[PDB]
Design an enzyme around this catalytic site. Structure first.
Site, PDB file in Angstrom:
ATOM      1  N   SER A 233       4.158  -6.587   2.569  1.00  0.00           N
ATOM      2  CA  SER A 233       2.871  -6.397   3.228  1.00  0.00           C
ATOM      3  C   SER A 233       1.721  -6.939   2.389  1.00  0.00           C
ATOM      4  CB  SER A 233       2.648  -4.925   3.570  1.00  0.00           C
ATOM      5  OG  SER A 233       3.863  -4.319   4.009  1.00  0.00           O
ATOM      6  N   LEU A 234       0.893  -6.052   1.837  1.00  0.00           N
ATOM      7  CA  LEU A 234      -0.191  -6.502   0.967  1.00  0.00           C
ATOM      8  C   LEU A 234       0.406  -7.388  -0.120  1.00  0.00           C
ATOM      9  CD1 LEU A 234      -1.390  -5.858  -2.057  1.00  0.00           C
ATOM     10  CD2 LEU A 234      -3.004  -6.614  -0.273  1.00  0.00           C
TER      11      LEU A 234
ATOM     12  N   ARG B 103      -9.383  -8.065   4.957  1.00  0.00           N
ATOM     13  CA  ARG B 103      -8.164  -7.606   5.613  1.00  0.00           C
ATOM     14  C   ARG B 103      -8.167  -6.101   5.787  1.00  0.00           C
ATOM     15  NH1 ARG B 103      -2.860  -6.166   4.262  1.00  0.00           N
ATOM     16  NH2 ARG B 103      -1.156  -7.177   5.409  1.00  0.00           N
TER      17      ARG B 103
ATOM     18  N   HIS C  45       1.086  -3.565  11.322  1.00  0.00           N
ATOM     19  CA  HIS C  45       2.314  -4.330  11.591  1.00  0.00           C
ATOM     20  C   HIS C  45       2.937  -4.040  12.958  1.00  0.00           C
ATOM     21  CE1 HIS C  45       2.033  -6.023   7.688  1.00  0.00           C
ATOM     22  NE2 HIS C  45       2.092  -4.841   7.102  1.00  0.00           N
TER      23      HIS C  45
ATOM     24  N   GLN D 125       0.823  -1.215   0.000  1.00  0.00           N
ATOM     25  CA  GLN D 125       0.000   0.000   0.000  1.00  0.00           C
ATOM     26  C   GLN D 125       0.841   1.241   0.000  1.00  0.00           C
ATOM     27  OE1 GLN D 125      -3.511  -0.422   2.268  1.00  0.00           O
ATOM     28  NE2 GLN D 125      -4.138   1.754   2.106  1.00  0.00           N
TER      29      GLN D 125
ATOM     30  N   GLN E 233       1.927 -11.987  10.271  1.00  0.00           N
ATOM     31  CA  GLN E 233       2.394 -10.843   9.476  1.00  0.00           C
ATOM     32  C   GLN E 233       1.745  -9.534   9.893  1.00  0.00           C
ATOM     33  OE1 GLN E 233       0.618  -9.390   6.116  1.00  0.00           O
ATOM     34  NE2 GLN E 233       2.448  -9.361   4.784  1.00  0.00           N
TER      35      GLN E 233
END
EC number: 2.3.1.39
Length: 305
Positions: free
Chosen positions: A90-91, A115, A199, A9, A248
């Site tokens: 991440s994503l 999510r 995170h 993102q 994660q």
């Protein structure tokens, strides 16, 4: 030998992939599968915006996942060889897992929408923050964060390269931590257009709920190794991958070490399979003999093929 890396993102922009779509019909075909799963027109969202809609994270995530998968699909369609390995930031980990055949594309699309919603609701707007710490070593940042927490939450959440680290947590603690980072020698502590403090431990209750959704989804063995954000491990067991996606969400993204790991495996070039050039730019800062380039423009795509 090359790896594919998949951005997260922040890499999206209004108009992304427009030229690739004009050269390769499979791009919009891919976005239509995704749109059918989401119940709105994902392509139109990415092409028309407005930006503020594209940057709402439950919409950002499916948008970026779909962009990356479309690019991958162009690569495969045009006869491209499989990468030696994949990693996603991440994503982007979801994107890698789709392209490696672990999660069905439409499943993943719905998944990252949820999510996004879980993340957004994790914490009230204005309670969380993220800051980019520039020019301080990893360890001094962790210490700064520990000292600053004072019963609130703040920690390193992205290790992006040596001297480029994102922290996140409660607003007030992220402020404390920025200052301590400056005091310790950091060149910058730049506040980000965040809100969602991803995170760190604040994402826990979002992660618990993600776990419930993930369990509903078939996970297959990967056809190429995927190095995960949380452990820097290539898991092949579906439930282990599952578990790694849960963990994660509330743990730091180890991008620096994932890129080092890939190099340590003989990878020499990273192709960024996604819009923007974020991961491309990190690459040399992590390992200066590694090269990288993006595959989101038709010419680059052709040159690489």
């Amino acid at each position: 030998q090359f790896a594919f890396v998949f951005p997260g993102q922040g890499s999206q922009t209004v108009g992304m992939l427009a030229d690739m779509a004009a050269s390769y019909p499979i791009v919009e075909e891919t976005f239509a599968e995704a749109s059918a799963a989401l119940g709105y027109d994902l392509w139109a969202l990415t092409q028309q915006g407005p930006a503020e809609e594209l940057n709402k994270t439950w919409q950002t995530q499916p948008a970026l996942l779909t962009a990356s998968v479309a690019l991958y699909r162009v690569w495969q369609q045009q006869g491209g060889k499989a990468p030696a390995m994949m990693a996603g930031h991440s994503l982007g980990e979801y994107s890698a897992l789709v392209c490696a055949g672990v999660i069905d594309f439409a499943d993943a699309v719905r998944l990252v929408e949820m999510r996004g919603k879980f993340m957004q609701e994790a914490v009230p707007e204005g309670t969380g923050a993220m800051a980019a710490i520039i020019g301080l070593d990893d360890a001094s940042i962790a210490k700064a964060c520990e000292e600053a927490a004072e019963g609130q939450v703040v920690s390193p959440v992205n290790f992006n390269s040596p001297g480029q680290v994102v922290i996140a947590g409660h607003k007030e603690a992220v402020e404390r931590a920025g200052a301590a980072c400056k005091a310790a020698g950091a060149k910058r502590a730049l506040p980000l257009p965040v809100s969602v403090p991803s995170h760190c431990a604040l994402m826990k209750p979002a992660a618990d709920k993600l776990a419930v959704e993930l369990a509903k989804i078939t996970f297959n063995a990967p056809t190429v190794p995927v190095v995960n954000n949380v452990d820097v491990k290539c898991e092949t067991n579906g439930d282990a991958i599952r578990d790694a996606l849960v963990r994660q969400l509330y743990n730091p993204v180890q991008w620096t070490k994932s890129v080092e790991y890939m190099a340590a495996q003989g990878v020499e070039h990273l192709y960024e399979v996604g819009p923007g050039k974020v991961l491309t730019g990190l690459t040399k800062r992590i390992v200066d003999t590694l090269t990288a380039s993006a595959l989101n423009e038709p010419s680059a795509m052709a040159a690489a093929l």
